[PDB]
A paper describes a structure:
In bacteria, transcription initiation is performed by the RNAP holoenzyme (Eσ) assembled from the RNAP core (E; subunits α2ωββ′) and the σ subunit to mediate promoter recognition and DNA melting. Group II σ subunits (Eco σ38 and Mtb σB) have a shorter region 1.1 compared with group I and are implicated in the stress response and stationary phase growth. We found that like the transcription activator RNAP-binding protein A, −10 ssDNA induced σ subunit loading onto the DNA/RNA channels of RNAP.
The respective maps were refined to 3.43 and 3.48 Å. In the Mtb EσB bearing docked σR4, the overall σB path matched that of σB in the consensus I/II structures and that of σA in the published structures of Mtb RPo. Moreover, σR4 was inserted in the RNA exit channel and its residues σB-I247, L250, D316, Y321, and S323 contacted the β′-dock domain, residue σB-D278 contacted the β′-ZBD, and residues σB-A245 and V246 contacted the β-clamp. The distance between the Cα atoms of the σB residues 151 and 292 in the EσB/−10 ssDNA complex (docked σBR4), was 68 Å, which matches the distance in the Mtb RPo.
Numbering used by the authors:
A (entry chain c): 29 to 53
B (entry chain e): 28 to 110
C (entry chain c): 446 to 1147
D (entry chain a): 1 to 226
E (entry chain d): 444 to 1012, 1024 to 1176
F (entry chain d): 1226 to 1274
G (entry chain b): 1 to 232
Write the structure that this text describes.
C-alpha cells in the first residue's frame, strides 16, 4: 500500500487498516 | 601493614597526622617548609645561606612540597603553633 | 527530521503570550483535550517543558485557529468509511470510540461494550450502539518524531520523551543506512521533510550525474534538477544529495530521485545498525557508558562530516581603508606559503590551529616605537610598517581542508553593509570519526558516551567469529523501565538473520494473526512495527525460534534470544548465555570536540576586569557560591582566597603571579579584589560615606 | 603419566578461502587459550598491502565532484577502501586508472606495475557518462595493522594528494572450537579446530604461518630468560 | 586530555621547556607551545608529576562535590573519572560535564593535597557511613561471587562407605587450580584449609584457645571458594567473613575497616574490591530478555475477580446510593488491593536466579515496584489534579500498554519532570538560608567544661524483653561525647565521663542494662562564640574528634540541604522541613495540653470543643477545633495509636490531642526550650527518615541552637532596651 | 540577601559599623576566612629544622 | 617487519618462592595474548611428581579415624597431599612410612626408594600417642597438571585404596595483570606483570623457562607450516 511509487518494500506487523492516509506533514 | 603507596599519597596521611595536632596545622607546617625550600633553590646561585635547604636528600626532580612532606614524615622538623 | 519538527512546533511563549516566570505550573501539564491535537510525549527536557509541543500526525488547523482531528462516525453501530473533523467542543459534546476496539469485517462491533472517551478525562465501557465516533488509527495521539520509535507502547513516558527529543539531534553520517526495524512513518517523514528531490512529473531519465540529473517528461519537455552537494547546514552539519537512479529508467511521478542527508532510498535513516550485546564488561560500560568495537572507527561506520565557516571584512576607517594583501608585516615566508596572490588560502590546503586564513593590513596612526623595537627596525632595514596585522586566523580547535571560498567586492556592484568594501568567507570542512566522549543513543531514550574503543580482537565474538560492535550495560535497562529496547533488539536480530515459519503442518497458533506475506523473510530483510499496533510478544517468541541458519549451517541465538559468546581477552566462553541482536544506534551532536575547554591566561573584561573572551580564546569557568560553600566546609581557606583574588580580579596580582610562575620565585600574596574596590567606589557615589577602619577608628586608604 | 605424543597440526580445506586446522592432543583446559592467542595475533599482526593515498585529475580535495561520474569523490574513496591488493615491493609504488567514455569502471581496469596485482577484478568503483572521464593515480604500500589517513597530512605534499585510510590486514574471520575428551581415564585431552578466512590476498596457510612465527619470536624472550 | 593539560599548565610547561634548553627564551617557548612541537609532551609529562587538580561537577550540592585528584595524561578529549567517586559527585557518564581547576601556590597545593584529596573522603560528612564504596555494578559482581548455591559441581560430600569425602582442599591455590580445570564451581560448599586468613572470633577462641592467630597457622574452614577469594581482598588480620555480600554487608565491612584501620588501608582495600567486583560482574550472567521477564501465571484470574468486584461497586453507585466521592474511594481501595495482590503473586512466581531479581535483591539498584510495573501491573496512575484516577492500567510495560492507558499514564511523567525543577530550586533556597543562619558556628575551643547535657534514651527496656535497641540509636547517640559517666547499678563505671561514645561503648552500655544516658551536645555549649570541640563530638568524615577551627555550620547546612533533591512528597515533603525550620504556624495546628489535668471534652459535630480540668486546680482551657479532621491517639498508658480520644482521662502538659503538628511557639511557651528543641529535632528527623535518608542529629542541633538564641523582653525597667 | 535598598538606607541612618569576623564578609573582601586554616592559631606558625 | 621497541623482562623478587616478572614494552593488544597463554602453560605444562594414592592398614575404610592418631583420616590425606616429591622414574613407585610409640611423624622420616626424593623433610604429617603406630603405602607417579581423584576412582580392586587429588605441578599459583606504558605519544603499550609462586621443586625462573620451552615447541608446529618472515 506504498502511496509513493518507488518506496522500498518493508512488510509490517499491521493488524489494522488505516482509512485515512497521513496528510501533508 | 599495606602495599607500598604510590603517587601523591606517599607518605601516608595517618603517619603525618601522628606528628601534627590536626590536618589544618599540617597543611601550613608543610607549605611553609615548601616555601623555604623554594627560596633556598632560588638563592642557590648566589646569596647568604640563611635558609637551609632540604634536609632529606631529594629525588630526581622532586617538587619542593613533596620534599617538605617527606622530611616532615622523617621526623626532622619541629614547629610552634600560634595562639 | 529536526527541520520538519521545528516547522511543526507549537510554541506557547514569546510576544503576546506567557512568560516563564509569570506562568504557573498548572499550564505545563497535560489535559484530556490534547488527545489527537498536541502530542503529549514530545517536549523539551529543559525548563521549557509543557510550553512547547507539536501537532499530532493527523491534526489540522481550522480557519478560526482551533486544532481539528479526524474521526469516522458510526451511524447505527456500523463504522462508516467517510470521516469528519471535530474540534474540542464538538468532541466533548459527542462520544468517541477507541481504534484498537475490535471490529468485524462487516463493521459490526464484536464486543457489546467498548472502551470509550467522554467529556473530560472520563473513560468507561458503553454499549456498542450509543458510541457515536471512532478514531482513525492508534497513532493519532503521537507527533511525527514520536511516531517513529518502534515498540513505543512498551517504553515509559519520560524515556519516550527523551528518545523523541534525541531523535532530533542525530548527525548525518557519510553513508546512511535504513533501519532494520522501524515504523511506517520513516518514508513519509523523509518525503515531506523536503530534503529529498522528488520528480514533479513522470518521465524517463536521459543522463544522470553526481552534480545534476536531466529527466525527459512524457510531453517532450526536459527538466534538470540541480542537487546541492556538501552545502553547510544551519548548525554546522553537511547536506549532500546523491542520486539513486540509473540512466534509461522510467520514473513515475512523485518518486524520489535523490536522497538528502539522513536518507537511504527515500526513507529517513538517522543512524546505522550495530550488533549489540547486553552485558557488563569489565566496568568500561559502567553507569551508562558505552564500549565500541574499533571496526566502527576503521570502517567509517560512524564517520561524520562537519563544515565550519569563517569570514572577515575590509571596512573603511577614518584613518584609511583596510585592504587584503598577500604581504603581511614581519612574518616568515614559510607561514605564508599557502596564501595565494590575492591573499587568501588556496582551496584544498590543509589548515591547522592558529594558521593564517586570509591576510589583511589595517591602517595605523602614530605610535612611537619602543626603544629596542625601533632599534631592531633600524638594524634589519625593516621599516616601521605602521600598518598593523589583523589577518583572520583559524580559531582554536579547528582543522581540515578549505573546500570553498566566497568573496564579495564592492567594486563588482555587490550589496555589502554600509562602510564595507571587501567581504570574504572561507569554509573549512572537517571529517570527524567517533572517538571517546562522543554521544551515542538509540531510539528508546538511552544515552551514553564512548567509554572505550576496544580493538576488534578484544570484543566478544559469536560462536562463528563475528565480533560484537557494541556492548550495553544491563543494570540500566530495567531500572529506567524502557524494556522496548530489548524487544527491538530481538526483532532486529530476527530481521537480519531472516526467518522461515514452519507451515508444512499448518500455520502455528502464535502465527494466526501474522500477515500471510510475513511468514517468510530473507536474510537482512526490512521489517516494521507501527506504533501502538505491531508485533506482540508472542510474535517475537515465535519468530526467534524459526530464524534461518548461517552459511556455516549453525544457529547462533537460542529460542530465548541469548547466545553463547567467547571472551576476547581470556579466550574462554562466558559461563552463561548473553543477549545479542542488531539495535539501531544514532550519533548525537554533543560531540567532545566542541565541549573541551581550557584557559590558563587570556583576555579580560573591561568594566569588571574578570576573565573573559570569545570561545576563540576560551573563557574561564564559573566559581559560584555553592562552589564556595564546598570550599569553606573543607576548612580550605588559601584556595578560596586565591580562586577569587589572585586569578580572578586582582589587576596587578594577576600580572605578578604570572611573572612569578614564569620565573623561579614564589607566588606573591594576593591583594584586594577589584570587585570590592568597584563596590566601594560605587557605594560612595550614592552619597553614602563608606570607609573601612581599624580598631582605633582611623579611616583607611584603599 | 606424561603424554608421549606432542601436538600435531593438520590442515583441512572446506573452500578456496576457508580452511580448518586440527591441533591435538592438547593438555586439558589448554585449547581455548591457544586458540584465542592465535586468533588475537591473526587479526592484528598479519602484514599486508593496501592503498595509502590517491590523486584524481581535476580534484583538489575529497569534498567535491568530478564531471561525468555518478558519485562524489567520497563515494569513490569509500569504494576503493575495500580494494584488496598484494605488493611484493617494499617501497611505495604507484598505480594508474584511466577510463573514458560511457560505461562502468571496475578494479580490473587498473594497470598495476610489476610486483603488484589486484585479486578482485570484478569490483565496482564508479560509473561514467559519455560526457566525463576519470584518471586516478594511487599509491600502494606494505604494512600491518591500521594506519589513520592523517599519516600523509604532515608529509607536506601537493594539494592534489588525497590521503586515504589504510587497512593492512588480509585476515577476515577467525573462529575456534574445542572438543574436550574428558574421560574417567587419565587419557583426557582436548582437540582444537581453528577456522580462518582470508581476504584472498594470501592463502590461510601463509597467515597461520606468519602468526606462528610472530608468536615464536615474541616468546623467545622467555627462552633467553633462562 | 593532553590538549587540555598543555593549555592549562602553559606557564609551568613553557618555563620547564626553557630550562631544559629546548628554547632560548620565553617568546620562543610560547611560540613552540602554541605550535605544539613534539618536544613539549615530555616536559608536560614531567611538570605534572605530583600537581593535584580540583574536579568540580556543577551543581555542587554538598561538601564532597569538590575533590582533588592527581592528574594523568591520556589521549582523547574526555576527563576520565574513577568509578567509585561518581557516587560522591552524583555523576552519570551520559553526557555530564565537570569543571577542573588548578591550585598554583604551595599553600594551595598542600591544601588540596591534604584536605581535599579523594582518598581521604571515604566517609560522607552527613552521617558516618561510607560513600565511596562498591555501589552499582561491582556490587552485583561481589554478590554473585560470594553467593552459595546447593548441589553445585564439586560440593563437599560426606563419606559413603568405601568412598571418602570429596571436597577437601589443601589450600586456596589448589582450589583455584581445580576451578580452572573445570571440576569445581567457584561458588560451592567446600572445606579448604586456610593459612593467611584470620579465623572468625568464634573459631579463633576454640581452635587456638584465643592464643592469637598468626600467618602460617592452618585451620579448617567450611565455605565456598568465592568467599575465600573475596576475603583475600580485605586487609590482612581482618576476621574471616562468611556471609553473602549484600550491599548492607559491604557497607558494614567498609565502616568497620574505616573505624579500625588507617584511611590508606581503607582506600587500598576499596580499590581492590572495586576491581574484583568489576571483573566478576561480567561473568555473573546478568542479562535481559523476554525469557527473563516472566509474566505472572495467574494474573488473569486475579484481574477478573477484582474487576468483578469493581463492577459490583459501580452498580451499587448506579443505584444512586453513593455519590462521586464514595465511588472514587471504593474504586481506589479495590485497585490498590488488587495491585498489592498481583505484586505478591509475581514475587512468588519469580525464582532467585533471574537477572531482574538478582539485581533488585542484591541491593545494587532499583526497587521491587519497578519490577512489578515492568512485569506485573503498573497500577492506577496519578492525575494532574493529584487524585488517583479510578481507572487503572491492567497491562504492564512488558505486555504493552494501549492508547488510552498510555495517554493517561503520560500525566504522571509530565508532572514529575515539571516538579523536579521546582524541587531543586526550593532545595537550593533552603540550603542558602541554612548556610545563612549558621555562618557563625565554628569550633573555637577544645572544651568548655560545662555540665549541662541533653539526656537521650539509648534503648528502652521492654516490659517482657530484657532490652530492645532503639531503632535510631545510629543517629541520636552514636558519636556524641558522654556528658556524665554512666554508672551501673553498682559503683562500677561502664564508661568514664568525657569519653566519646561508639559501637563498643554502646554495646557495653546495652549489656550493662543502662538505658538513659546524658550525652554532651552542641546545643548546651557554654562557649560565647562558636561551639567547643568536645560538645560537638566526634566528626563524621574524619572519624575522630573534630579539630579546632573546622567550620561546622556550613557542613550542617550542606548536609541538611543535600537530601532535598530526593526528598519526595499537611504535606510531608520538603515544604514540611521548610516550614518547620521557618518556625511558622503549622497548617494542622493541633491543640496542646496547656496544663496537665483530666480532660472533659464535649464532641461538637460542627466545631470540636475541648476542655481540660486541671488536676491541681484552676479553670478549664477551651479549645474550639474544627470537626472536619480526625482524632489522634490520646496519650494513655497503652499508647496504642488505634485508641480514640476518650473523655475524662488524664493527659500530660503540652501533649497534642488531634492530628497535625503542634505550633513550635506554643510548645516552647508552655513547656520550655528543652522540649521545643526536642520536638523540632524529632519532627525534622522524622520527615527525613520517612523517605529513607539519614543525617546525624548534631547537624540539626547546630541549626536549632542558632534558631533559639534570643530572649524577648516584655518590660525594660532599668534597661535601655525597648 | 533581601531588601538591599532598605538595608542600605537603614545602615546609613544608624551609621552602623560591622566587624569583619564572618565567612561571607571575608570572602567578599578577599581576606582569609576565619575558619579551617585561616584562624590565627594556624596561620602564624614558625617552622624551622 | 621489525619491532619498534624490543620487549625485555626484568625479574623482581618478593620472597624466596614468589617472584614478579615484568615484560615491557609490548605492542598494543599483545599483553593478554602473551599473559594468558603463558599463565596457562606455566600452570599445566611443567611435568612433576606427587602422591597419587595412599593406604592405611589400620583402618578398613575412611569414615572413621585411624586409631592412635589425633588427626582425622581426611586430615592425614590432606597433610600428605601437600607433600613435595621429586621423582625421576617413569613408573609409579611405592613408598612406606612406619613409626611406633608416642611422638610426631615428619615427612623426613619416610624412607624414599631409589630416584624419588622429598624436598621438605621437616613437614609435619601426624602425631602418635603412647603405643601408637601407623603404616601407610603411598604410591608416587610423575605427570603434569592437576588431576582429581574421582577420575582416578577406578583403579583395580584393593582393600583400603584411597585415591587422592594429586598435584602434578611444581607451580601452584600464577597471576597476571597489564598496565599502560609511555614509550612514545602512543601511550598505550602493555606491561605484563606475571606473578608466579612455585614449590621447592623448581625455582620460578626455571618454571618460566620450561613454560616458554613448551610453548615455543608447540607454536613451532604452526611456524613450520610455511616460510614467511616477521619481526623480532
Ligand atoms: Mg547525566
Ligand atoms: Zn562546649
Amino acid at each position: 500500500n506504498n502511496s509513493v511509487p518507488g518506496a522500498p518494500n518493508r512488510v509490517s506487523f499491521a493488524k489494522l487498516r488505516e482509512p485515512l492516509e497521513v496528510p501533508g506533514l | 601493614g599495606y602495599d607500598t603507596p604510590l603517587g601523591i599519597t606517599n607518605p601516608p596521611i595517618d603517619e603525618l597526622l601522628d606528628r601534627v595536632s590536626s590536618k589544618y596545622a599540617l597543611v601550613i607546617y608543610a607549605a611553609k617548609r615548601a616555601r623555604q625550600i623554594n627560596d633556598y633553590y632560588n638563592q642557590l646561585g648566589e646569596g647568604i645561606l640563611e635558609y637551609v635547604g632540604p634536609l632529606v636528600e631529594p629525588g630526581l626532580q622532586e617538587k619542593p612540597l613533596s620534599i617538605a612532606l617527606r622530611e616532615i614524615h622523617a621526623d626532622l622538623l619541629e614547629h610552634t603553633e600560634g595562639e | 527530521l529536526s527541520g520538519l519538527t521545528h516547522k511543526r512546533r507549537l510554541s506557547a511563549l514569546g510576544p503576546g503570550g506567557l512568560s516563564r516566570e509569570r506562568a504557573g505550573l498548572e499550564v505545563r501539564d497535560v489535559h484530556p483535550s490534547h488527545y489527537g491535537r498536541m502530542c503529549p510525549i514530545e517536549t523539551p527536557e529543559g525548563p521549557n517543558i509543557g510550553l512547547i509541543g507539536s501537532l499530532s500526525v493527523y491534526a489540522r488547523v481550522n480557519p478560526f485557529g482551533f486544532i481539528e482531528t479526524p474521526y469516522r462516525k458510526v451511524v447505527d453501530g456500523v463504522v462508516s468509511d467517510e470521516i469528519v473533523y471535530l474540534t474540542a467542543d464538538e468532541e466533548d459534546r459527542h462520544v468517541v470510540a477507541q481504534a484498537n476496539s475490535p471490529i468485524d469485517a462487516d463493521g459490526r462491533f464484536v464486543e457489546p461494550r467498548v472502551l470509550v472517551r467522554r467529556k473530560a478525562g472520563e473513560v468507561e465501557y458503553v454499549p456498542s450502539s450509543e458510541v457515536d465516533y471512532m478514531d482513525v488509527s492508534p497513532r493519532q495521539m503521537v507527533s511525527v518524531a514520536t511516531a517513529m520509535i518502534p515498540f513505543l507502547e512498551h517504553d515509559d513516558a519520560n524515556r519516550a520523551l527523551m528518545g523523541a527529543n534525541m531523535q532530533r539531534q542525530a548527525v548525518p553520517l557519510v553513508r546512511s543506512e535504513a533501519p532494520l526495524v522501524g515504523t511506517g512513518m520513516e518514508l513519509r517523514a523523509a518525503i515531506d521533510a523536503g530534503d529529498v528531490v522528488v520528480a514533479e512529473e513522470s518521465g524517463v531519465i536521459e543522463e544522470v550525474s553526481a552534480d545534476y540529473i536531466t529527466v525527459m517528461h512524457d510531453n517532450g519537455t526536459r527538466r534538470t534538477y540541480r542537487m546541492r552537494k556538501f552545502a553547510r547546514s544551519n548548525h554546522g552539519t553537511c547536506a549532500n544529495q546523491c542520486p539513486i537512479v540509473d540512466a534509461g529508467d522510467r520514473v513515475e511521478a512523485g518518486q524520489v530521485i535523490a536522497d538528502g542527508p539522513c536518507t537511504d532510498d527515500g526513507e529517513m535513516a538517522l543512524g546505522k545498525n550495530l550488533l549489540v550485546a547486553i552485558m557488563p564488561w569489565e566496568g568500561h560500560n559502567y553507569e551508562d557508558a558505552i564500549i565500541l568495537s574499533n571496526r566502527l572507527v576503521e570502517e567509517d561506520v560512524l564517520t561524520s562530516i562537519h563544515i565550519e565557516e569563517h569570514e572577515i571584512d575590509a571596512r573603511d576607517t577614518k584613518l584609511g581603508a583596510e585592504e587584503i594583501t598577500r604581504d603581511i608585516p614581519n612574518i616568515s615566508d614559510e607561514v605564508l606559503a599557502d596564501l595565494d596572490e590575492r591573499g587568501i588560502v588556496r582551496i584544498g590546503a590543509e589548515v591547522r590551529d592558529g594558521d593564517i586564513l586570509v591576510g589583511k593590513v589595517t591602517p595605523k596612526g602614530e605610535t612611537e616605537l619602543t626603544p629596542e623595537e625601533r632599534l631592531l627596525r633600524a638594524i634589519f632595514g625593516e621599516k616601521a610598517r605602521e600598518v598593523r596585522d589583523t589577518s583572520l586566523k583559524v580559531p582554536h580547535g579547528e582543522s581540515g581542508k578549505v573546500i570553498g571560498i566566497r568573496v564579495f567586492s564592492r567594486e563588482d556592484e555587490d550589496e555589502l553593509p554600509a562602510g564595507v568594501n571587501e567581504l570574504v568567507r572561507v569554509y573549512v570542512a572537517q571529517k570527524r570519526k567517533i572517538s571517546d566522549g562522543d554521544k551515542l543513543a538509540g531510539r528508546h531514550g538511552n544515552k551514553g558516551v564512548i567509554g572505550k574503543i576496544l580493538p576488534v580482537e578484544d570484543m566478544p565474538f559469536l560462536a562463528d567469529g563475528t565480533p560484537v560492535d557494541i556492548i550495553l550495560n544491563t543494570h540500566g535497562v530495567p531500572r529506567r523501565m524502557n524494556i522496548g529496547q530489548i524487544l527491538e533488539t530481538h526483532l532486529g536480530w530476527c530481521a537480519h538473520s531472516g526467518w522461515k515459519v514452519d507451515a508444512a503442518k499448518g500455520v502455528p497458533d502464535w502465527a494466526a494473526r501474522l500477515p500471510d506475506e510475513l511468514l517468510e523473510a530473507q536474510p537482512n530483510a526490512i521489517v516494521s512495527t507501527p506504533v501502538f499496533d505491531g508485533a506482540q510478544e508472542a510474535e517475537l517468541q515465535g519468530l526467534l525460534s524459526c530464524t534461518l541458519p548461517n552459511r556455516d549451517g549453525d544457529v547462533l541465538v537460542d529460542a530465548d534470544g541469548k547466545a553463547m559468546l567467547f571472551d576476547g581477552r581470556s579466550g574462554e566462553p562466558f559461563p552463561y548465555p548473553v543477549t545479542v541482536g542488531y539495535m539501531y544506534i544514532m550519533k548525537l551532536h554533543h560531540l567532545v570536540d566542541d565541549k573541551i575547554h581550557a584557559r590558563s591566561t587570556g583576555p579580560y573584561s573591561m568594566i569588571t576586569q574578570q576573565p573573559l573572551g570569545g570561545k576563540a580564546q576560551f573563557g574561564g569557568q564559573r566559581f559560584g557560591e555553592m562552589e564556595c560553600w564546598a570550599m569553606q566546609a573543607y576548612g580550605a581557606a588559601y584556595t578560596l582566597q586565591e580562586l577569587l583574588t589572585i586569578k580572578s580580579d586582582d589587576t596587578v596580582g594577576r600580572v605578578k603571579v604570572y611573572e612569578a610562575i614564569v620565573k623561579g620565585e614564589n607566588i606573591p600574596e594576593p591583594g584586594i579584589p577589584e570587585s570590592f574596590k568597584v563596590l566601594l567606589k560605587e557605594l560612595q557615589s550614592l552619597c553614602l560615606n563608606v570607609e573601612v577602619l581599624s580598631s582605633d577608628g582611623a579611616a583607611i586608604e584603599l | 603419566m606424561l603424554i608421549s605424543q606432542r601436538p600435531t597440526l593438520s590442515e583441512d580445506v572446506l573452500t578456496d578461502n576457508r580452511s580448518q586446522f586440527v591441533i591435538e592432543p592438547l593438555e586439558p583446559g589448554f585449547g581455548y587459550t591457544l586458540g584465542n592467542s592465535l586468533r588475537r595475533t591473526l587479526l592484528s599482526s598479519i602484514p599486508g598491502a593496501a592503498v595509502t593515498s590517491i590523486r584524481i585529475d581535476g580534484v583538489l580535495h575529497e569534498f567535491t565532484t568530478v564531471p561525468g561520474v555518478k558519485e562524489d569523490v567520497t563515494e569513490i574513496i569509500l569504494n576503493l577502501k575495500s580494494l584488496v591488493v598484494s605488493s611484493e615491493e617494499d617501497e611505495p609504488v604507484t598505480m594508474y586508472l584511466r577510463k573514458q567514455g560511457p560505461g562502468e569502471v571496475t578494479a580490473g581496469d587498473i594497470v598495476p606495475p610489476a610486483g603488484v596485482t589486484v585479486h578482485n577484478p570484478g569490483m565496482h568503483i564508479a560509473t561514467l557518462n559519455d560526457k566525463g572521464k576519470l584518471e586516478v593515480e594511487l599509491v600502494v604500500e606494505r604494512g600491518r595493522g591500521y594506519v589513520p589517513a592523517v599519516q600523509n597530512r604532515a608529509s607536506g605534499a601537493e594539494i592534489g594528494r588525497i590521503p586515504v585510510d589504510s587497512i593492512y590486514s588480509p585476515v577476515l574471520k577467525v573462529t575456534y572450537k574445542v572438543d574436550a575428551t574428558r574421560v574417567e581415564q587419565r587419557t583426557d585431552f582436548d582437540k582444537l579446530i581453528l577456522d580462518v578466512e582470508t581476504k584472498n590476498s594470501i592463502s590461510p596457510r601463509d597467515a597461520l604461518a606468519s602468526a606462528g612465527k610472530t608468536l615464536v619470536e615474541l616468546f623467545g624472550l622467555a627462552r633467553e630468560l633462562n | 586530555p593532553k590538549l587540555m593539560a598543555l593549555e592549562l599548565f602553559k606557564p609551568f610547561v613553557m618555563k620547564r621547556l626553557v630550562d631544559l634548553n629546548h628554547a632560548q627564551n620565553i617568546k620562543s617557548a610560547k611560540r613552540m607551545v602554541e605550535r605544539q612541537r613534539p618536544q613539549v609532551w615530555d616536559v608536560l609529562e614531567e611538570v605534572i608529576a605530583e600537581h593535584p587538580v580540583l574536579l568540580n561537577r556543577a551543581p555542587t550540592l554538598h561538601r564532597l562535590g569538590i575533590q582533588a585528584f592527581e592528574p594523568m595524561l591520556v589521549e582523547g578529549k574526555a576527563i576520565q573519572l574513577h568509578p567509585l567517586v561518581c557516587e560522591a559527585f552524583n555523576a552519570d557518564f551520559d553526557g555530564d560535564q565537570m569543571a577542573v581547576h588548578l591550585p598554583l601556590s604551595a599553600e594551595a597545593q598542600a591544601e588540596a593535597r591534604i584536605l581535599m584529596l579523594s582518598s581521604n573522603n571515604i566517609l560522607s560528612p552527613a552521617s558516618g557511613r561510607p560513600l565511596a564504596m562498591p555501589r552499582l555494578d561491582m556490587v552485583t559482581g561481589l554478590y554473585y561471587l560470594t553467593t552459595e548455591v546447593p548441589g553445585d559441581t564439586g560440593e563437599y560430600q560426606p563419606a559413603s562407605g568405601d568412598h571418602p569425602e570429596t571436597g577437601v582442599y589443601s589450600s586456596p591455590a589448589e582450589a583455584i587450580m581445580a576451578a580452572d580445570r573445570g571440576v569445581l564451581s567457584v561458588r560451592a560448599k567446600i572445606k579448604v584449609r586456610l593459612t593467611q586468613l584470620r579465623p572468625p572470633v568464634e573459631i579463633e577462641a576454640e581452635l587456638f584457645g584465643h592464643s592469637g592467630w598468626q600467618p602460617g597457622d592452618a585451620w579448617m574452614a567450611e565455605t565456598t571458594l568465592g568467599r575465600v577469594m573475596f576475603n583475600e581482598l580485605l586487609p590482612l588480620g581482618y576476621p574471616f567473613v562468611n556471609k553473602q555480600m549484600h550491599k548492607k554487608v559491604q557497607a558494614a565491612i567498609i565502616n568497620d575497616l574505616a573505624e579500625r584501620y588507617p584511611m590508606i588501608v581503607v582506600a587500598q582495600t576499596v580499590d581492590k574490591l572495586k576491581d574484583a567486583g568489576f571483573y566478576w560482574a561480567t561473568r555473573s550472567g546478568v542479562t535481559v530478555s523476554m525469557a527473563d521477564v516472566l509474566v505472572p501465571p495467574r494474573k488473569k484470574e486475579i484481574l477478573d475477580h477484582y474487576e468483578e468486584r469493581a463492577d459490583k461497586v459501580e452498580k451499587q453507585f448506579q443505584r444512586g446510593a453513593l455519590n462521586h466521592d464514595e465511588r472514587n474511594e471504593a474504586l481506589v481501595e479495590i485497585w490498590k488491593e488488587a495491585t498489592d495482590e498481583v505484586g505478591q503473586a509475581l514475587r512468588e512466581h519469580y525464582p532467585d536466579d533471574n537477572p531482574i531479581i538478582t539485581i533488585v535483591d542484591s541491593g545494587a539498584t532499583g526497587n521491587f515496584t519497578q519490577t512489578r510495573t515492568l512485569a506485573g501491573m503498573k497500577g492506577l496512575v496519578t492525575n494532574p489534579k493529584g487524585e488517583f484516577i479510578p481507572r487503572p492500567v491492567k497491562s504492564s510495560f512488558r505486555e504493552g500498554l494501549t492508547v488510552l492507558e498510555y495517554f493517561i499514564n503520560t500525566h504522571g511523567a509530565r508532572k514529575g519532570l515539571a516538579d523536579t525543577a521546582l524541587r531543586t530550586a526550593d532545595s537550593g533556597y533552603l540550603t542558602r538560608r541554612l548556610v545563612d543562619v549558621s555562618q557563625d558556628v565554628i569550633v573555637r575551643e577544645h572544651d568548655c567544661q560545662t555540665e549541662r547535657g541533653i539526656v537521650v534514651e539509648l534503648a528502652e527496656r521492654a516490659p517482657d524483653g530484657t532490652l530492645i535497641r532503639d531503632p535510631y540509636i545510629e543517629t541520636s547517640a552514636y558519636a556524641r561525647t558522654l556528658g556524665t559517666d554512666a554508672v551501673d547499678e553498682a559503683g562500677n563505671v561502664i564508661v568514664e565521663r568525657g569519653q566519646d561514645l561508639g559501637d563498643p561503648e554502646i554495646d557495653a552500655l546495652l549489656a550493662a542494662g543502662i538505658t538513659q544516658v546524658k550525652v554532651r551536645s552542641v546545643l548546651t555549649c557554654a562557649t560565647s562564640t562558636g561551639v567547643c570541640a568536645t560538645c560537638y563530638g566526634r566528626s563524621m568524615a574524619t572519624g575522630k574528634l573534630v579539630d579546632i577551627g573546622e567550620a561546622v555550620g556550613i557542613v550542617a547546612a550542606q548536609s541538611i540541604g543535600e537530601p532535598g533533591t530526593q526528598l519526595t512528597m499537611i504535606t510531608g515533603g520538603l515544604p514540611r522541613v521548610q516550614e518547620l525550620f521557618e518556625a511558622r504556624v503549622p497548617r494542622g495546628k493541633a491543640p496542646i495540653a496547656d496544663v496537665t489535668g483530666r480532660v472533659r471534652l464535649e464532641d461538637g459535630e460542627r466545631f470540636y470543643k475541648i476542655t481540660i480540668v486541671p488536676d491541681d486546680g484552676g479553670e478549664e482551657v477551651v479549645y474550639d477545633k474544627i470537626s472536619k479532621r480526625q482524632r489522634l491517639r490520646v496519650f494513655k498508658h497503652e499508647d496504642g495509636s488505634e485508641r480514640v480520644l476518650s473523655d475524662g482521662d488524664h493527659v500530660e502538659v503540652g501533649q497534642q490531642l488531634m492530628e497535625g503538628s503542634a505550633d513550635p511557639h506554643e510548645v516552647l511557651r508552655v513547656q520550655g526550650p528543652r522540649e521545643v528543641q526536642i520536638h523540632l529535632v524529632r519532627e525534622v528527623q522524622e520527615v527525613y527518615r520517612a523517605q529513607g535518608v539519614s543525617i546525624h542529629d548534631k547537624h540539626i542541633e547546630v541549626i536549632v541552637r542558632q534558631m533559639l538564641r534570643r530572649v524577648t523582653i516584655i518590660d525594660s525597667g532599668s534597661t535601655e532596651f525597648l | 540577601f533581601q531588601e538591599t535598598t532598605r538595608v542600605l538606607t537603614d545602615a546609613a541612618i544608624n551609621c552602623r559599623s560591622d566587624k569583619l569576623n564572618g565567612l561571607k564578609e571575608n570572602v567578599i573582601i578577599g581576606k582569609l576566612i576565619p575558619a579551617g586554616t585561616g584562624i590565627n592559631r594556624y596561620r602564624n606558625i614558625a617552622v624551622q629544622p
